[PDB]
Amino acid sequence: METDCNPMELSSMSGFEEGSELNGFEGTDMKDMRLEAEAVVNDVLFAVNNMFVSKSLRCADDVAYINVETKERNRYCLELTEAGLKVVGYAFDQVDDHLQTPYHETVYSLLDTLSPAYREAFGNALLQRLEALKRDGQS
């Protein structure tokens, strides 16, 4: 007389019975674009002024809009999809449907071209490894 409500799971998924094979007609990766998006934003946030997911549009599983504001206040809006990161605007929450702007593979090969300061910031974190091995390694 009831059904399964919306509870919380302290596990990956409720799977007590196992045996049958799952792979069949639908092979969904279960990859959430928002998931990957918020992961990207956090990791590269240090190399820009402010970066955040676009809350003025939409984001549903396959597609998520992100915004990035570099150190020189330059803003890029990114349509994150399975095709990678596709710039859809150069302003905050700016997405144009006629922009045939090229999409890149990762955020690295994208933002490295979007802000030279990002590259320099990478160099700073890179030289940290250099001096790390200089101090600890030969002593």
Inside any domain, residue 115? yes
Inside any domain, residue 87? yes
| DSSP class per residue in 62-115 | TEEEEEEE-TT--EEEEEEETTEEEEEESSTT---TT--PPEESSSHHHHHHH-
Domain total of the chain: 1
Contacts of 36 (CB under 8 A, 6+ apart): 64, 80
The dihedral formed by the CA atoms of 81, 86, 90 and 91, expressed in degrees to the nearest 10: 0
CA-closest candidate to residue 54, choices 92, 90, 88: 92
Inside any domain, residue 24? no
CA dist 6 and 40 (Å) reads 28
State the number of CA atoms in the 13 A half-sphere of 56 facing the CB: 9
Inside any domain, residue 5? no
State the number of CA atoms in the 13 A half-sphere of 79 facing the CB: 15
Write out the two tokens for 118: 């990002």
Bridge partners (DSSP) listed for residue 104: 85
Apex CA 77: angle with CA 43 and CA 34, to 5°? 55
CA dist 6 and 56 (Å) reads 27
Inside any domain, residue 18? no
- Elucidation method: NMR
Inside any domain, residue 1? no
Q: Are 93 and 49 in contact (CB under 8 A)?
A: no
Inside any domain, residue 36? yes
Inside any domain, residue 139? yes
Handedness of CA 40, 44, 46, 52 (dihedral sign): negative
Supply the CATH number for residue 46's domain: 3.30.2280.10
Long-range residue pairs from 30-39, CB within 8 A, at least 24 positions apart, any chain: 31/82, 32/61, 33/59, 33/61, 33/62, 33/63, 33/64, 33/80, 33/81, 34/59, 34/61, 34/64, 36/64, 36/80, 37/64, 37/66, 37/80
Give the domain range for residue 99: 32-139
Instruction: Report DSSP state, residue 36.
Output: H
Place of tokens 């605007």: 89
Helix H or strand E encompassing 59: strand 59-60
